[PDB]
Every structure is written in structure tokens, then in C-alpha cells.
Design a protein around this ligand. Structure first.
Ligand SMILES: COc1ccc(S(=O)(=O)N(CC(C)C)C[C@@H](O)[C@H](Cc2ccccc2)NC(=O)O[C@H]2CO[C@H]3O[C@@H]4OCC[C@@H]4[C@H]32)cc1
Ligand SMILES: [Cl-]
Ligand SMILES: [Cl-]
Ligand SMILES: [Cl-]
Ligand SMILES: [Cl-]
Ligand SMILES: [Cl-]
Ligand code: NA
Lengths: 99, 99
């Protein structure tokens, strides 16, 4: 698809068997999802943002569908105000910016 | 152009007679620029994201040149860790997300 930006670029994702809404966010290096349970071990990460920093849980090699496209990669979990699909997974679904 | 997302999608902008580097950011409703003077009236605003909120000055009807493409809109000025071109101006240069 070709997604214009008059509204927020929200899509459905599927992660841990669950459907969620998320933003497709070219200004995000990484993918950040609201508190949820994921399998396996996690590693610490601090991320930056507008407002300051946030600690998250880093889970690697997580299966995630984004707008019907399959990705497998790193998901940061924490108390984010919005679920964000960052460049680590936007590249896996073949997304580009065009003008 | 077509801009891939392997790296941050940074472009040169011209604002207030100054050249700056800025991130093309589909996850940002608003354009947010590091502290600078702009002409005309402003009003305070609070904007929110990964780490809470940041206070900014809202300037309306500001012309910008984004990678060669002129647009006009609202610009928020404050201590942003990164200069960000948000959807309010991305729409005006015809930017879309494609996959
Ligand atoms: C109303 O209008 C607004 C309101 C909010 C924002 S925002 O900057 O808070 N943001 C909203 C989004 C969280 C829903 C836009 C994002 O694209 C920011 C834009 C952003 C970039 C850098 C710093 C501050 C903000 N990215 C961001 O927070 O990314 C996080 C996740 O990945 C990491 O990559 C980034 O680069 C490393 C740190 C951040 C980390 C912008 C305009
Ligand atoms: Cl980015
Ligand atoms: Cl990844
Ligand atoms: Cl957005
Ligand atoms: Cl505007
Ligand atoms: Cl359009
Ligand atoms: Na003005």
C-alpha cells in the first residue's frame, strides 16, 4: 500500500497471538509496544524520546505481523503511550518514504 | 526521492533562514525544531511521547523548505533531542509510506 499522512499511519499488528493497533514510525529506530507478555529472556535497554528516557525490556527474534506482512525481530516492551513500529521492522516489511 | 529506512531518514531543511538537519518522522503529528528564534506570535504548548511531555513554543504559518520542497505550517520550538518533520508538513510535500 501507499499510505498518506493526513491521519496517523495506524495499522493492525499481531504479536503473541493478539491483535493491536500500532504506528508506523519512521522517526523511531526501534519498535516499542505497551506492556504485554512475551516468551523468553529479555535484556535491558534505555531509550530516548521527547520528554526524556524510558527503560524497556528488549526481546529479540519475536514473530510479529504488521499490516499483514511477516517480520521477526526485536521488540521493546514498556509503558509507551503508543505502540510504535520502528525502522528495525519497517525495513523487514520493505517500507520506504517517497515524495 | 525514495528514502529507505536502513538509517535515520535525515534531510536538510531551511527554516528561519537557517539550514538544519531533520528527521522525516511519520510518528510525529507535529514538527518540532530545536531552540531558535522565529518571527511572529507564539503560544505555549505541551507535547508528549516516549518520556512524558515537553513544553514548546507554537509558531503558526512558518515557511519551510524540506529537501528542496517548500511548505507552510505550524512549527513547535523547544529542547527536542532531535529536529523532527512531522505529518503536518510531510503531507504538504506529498510524502507517503510505501510497502
Ligand atoms: C504533537 O507532535 C508531536 C508529538 C510527539 C512527538 S515524539 O517525538 O514524541 N514522537 C511521537 C511518537 C513516540 C508517538 C515521534 C517519534 O518518531 C520520536 C521522534 C524522536 C526521535 C529522537 C528523540 C526524540 C524524539 N521517536 C522516538 O521516540 O523514538 C524512540 C524509539 O526508538 C528510538 O529512536 C529514536 O531515536 C533514538 C531515540 C528515539 C527512540 C513528535 C511530535
Ligand atoms: Cl529514525
Ligand atoms: Cl530487529
Ligand atoms: Cl503520526
Ligand atoms: Cl500545520
Ligand atoms: Cl495526498
Ligand atoms: Na505566525
Amino acid at each position: 500500500p501507499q499510505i498518506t499522512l493526513w491521519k496517523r499511519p495506524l495499522v493492525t499488528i499481531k504479536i503473541g497471538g493478539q491483535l493491536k493497533e500500532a504506528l508506523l514510525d519512521t522517526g523511531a529506530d526501534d519498535t516499542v509496544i505497551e506492556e504485554m507478555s512475551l516468551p523468553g529472556r529479555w535484556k535491558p535497554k534505555m531509550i530516548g524520546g521527547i520528554g526524556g528516557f524510558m527503560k524497556v525490556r528488549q526481546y529479540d527474534q519475536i514473530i510479529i505481523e504488521i499490516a499483514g506482512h511477516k517480520a521477526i525481530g526485536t521488540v521493546l516492551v514498556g509503558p509507551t503511550p503508543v505502540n510504535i513500529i520502528g525502522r528495525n521492522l519497517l525495513t523487514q516489511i520493505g517500507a520506504t518514504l517517497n515524495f
